């Protein structure tokens, strides 16, 4: 099903899956991470795109988060890939910084962003607790994870993504 296929992107506005472009809205804008030498100790922070900022989360006791600063982020903006250490080790399942990547056919990997020198800024994106504060949707594409904006994000708003139902229960949501 196009719904479940890695090769396809999805247009929020149209509900269309496509390979290159939505026929109505054109190709999606992927925002690049900033350049940082591989393995840099502050790699995850320094990889942050211009216009955003890592600062304490607005969620109580949630540590750091990612805020939008420069200007309105439109719907359908794409971020990623989520970087980290790829592994099947199940202690990665518990870092709290891992996304499951489905390789299809009851087999999977983890991309673990726990190590800041290996991860990118997306490790700092916190979990939405309600659909009203969620402005990012995580999804798998080309065997990797990306976040796309599912509403307009104004300056001064925290970016917030949904972690999946299992981790959400763990967070008390």
């Amino acid at each position: 099903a196009m719904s479940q296929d890695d090769d396809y992107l999805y247009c929020e506005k149209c509900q269309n899956f496509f390979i290159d472009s939505c026929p109505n809205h054109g190709p999606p804008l992927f925002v690049k991470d900033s350049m940082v030498d591989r393995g840099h100790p502050n790699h995850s922070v320094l990889s942050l795109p211009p216009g955003l900022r890592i600062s304490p989360s607005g969620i109580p006791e949630a540590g750091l988060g990612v805020w939008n600063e420069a200007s309105d982020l439109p719907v359908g903006l794409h971020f990623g890939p989520y970087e980290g250490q790829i592994t099947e080790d199940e202690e990665a399942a518990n870092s709290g910084y891992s996304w499951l990547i489905t390789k299809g056919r009851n087999c999977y990997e983890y991309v673990d962003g726990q190590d800041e020198s290996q991860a990118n800024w997306m490790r700092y994106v916190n979990c939405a607790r309600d659909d009203e504060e969620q402005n990012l949707v995580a999804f798998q594409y080309h065997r990797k994870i990306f976040y796309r904006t599912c509403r307009v994000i104004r300056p001064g708003c925290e970016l917030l993504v949904w972690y999946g139902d299992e981790y959400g229960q763990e967070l008390g949501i």
Binding site: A93, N94, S95, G96, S98, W99, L100, T102, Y110, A138, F139, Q140, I145, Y163, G164, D165, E166, Y167, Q169, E170
Partner: peptide, 7 residues
């Protein structure tokens, strides 16, 4: 169980 998962 702190594993982020897609739909």
């Amino acid at each position: 169980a702190r594993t982020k998962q897609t739909a």
